[PDB]
Structure 1
Amino acid sequence: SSGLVPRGSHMNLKQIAKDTAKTLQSYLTYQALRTVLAQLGETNPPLALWLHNFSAGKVQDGEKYIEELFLEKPDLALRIMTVREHIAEEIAEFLPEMVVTGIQQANMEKRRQHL
């Protein structure tokens, strides 16, 4: 046999997908927080200022952020919960085609100039 060659390609695909979904969920929670924030910009300027200062730097993990915002203001956490979910239902189905063709197009550019 020949065993200088690796047994695998190192694409643990369900782990990568699992990790990717949790990153999408955290970014969509950040997007929802941006929405709720802009809404409260029209609707409730104080409450907006509280949330903007509360959230600065907290945006790391979306589920940890939510459980921590629930401890302070259960209603506003719920506002972000609804919006993150509304966005996801509206946009998620377009993401596959955008990322696949996005990557193919970005690569195609660079292989053209370099290669």
Structure 2
Amino acid sequence: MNLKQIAKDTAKTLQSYLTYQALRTVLAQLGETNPPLALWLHNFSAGKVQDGEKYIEELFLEKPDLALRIMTVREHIAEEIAEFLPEMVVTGIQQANMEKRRQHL
């Protein structure tokens, strides 16, 4: 258990998923606000969602303003939710395991 490597890898995966969540937000906003721009971003992003930081630098090359919109939102979500994640994952895992050890073991 290389714990700082695992944590480092885990944080980068959370950051990429939160970038995907922000992209979902910005996309739903532009759904009300700017339907064309929404259609561009939805087709631009399909399959690109792999690495969040690579996705951002690539979206900056095309449309610096929209990349900034996703940058703000990913960060807003993180500041609002990240503090609840520890307790959710720890008790989530303990509860999911507890179920299976009950039926099987």
Coarse TM-score class (shorter-chain normalised): over 0.9
Structure 2: where are the runs of 5+ without partners? Answer: none
Identity in percent = 100
1:39 partnered with 2:29 = yes
TM-score by length of 1: 0.91
Superposed CA RMSD in Å reads 0.0
Task: Tell me the distance in 2 between the aligned counterparts of 1:46 and 1:109.
Answer: 47
Greater percentage in helix? 2
Write out per-residue CA displacement over residues 38-90 of structure 1, whole angstroms, 9 at most, x where no aligned residue. Answer: 00000000000000000000000000000000000000000000000000000
Task: Tell me the distance in 2 between the aligned counterparts of 1:68 and 1:90.
Answer: 26
Cα deviation, residue 114, structure 1: 0.0
Number of residue-to-residue matches in the alignment: 105
Cα deviation, residue 103, structure 1: 0.0
Structure 1: where are the runs of 5+ without partners? Answer: 1-10
Larger Rg: 1
Write out per-residue CA displacement over residues 8-66 of structure 1, whole angstroms, 9 at most, x where no aligned residue. Answer: xxx00000000000000000000000000000000000000000000000000000000
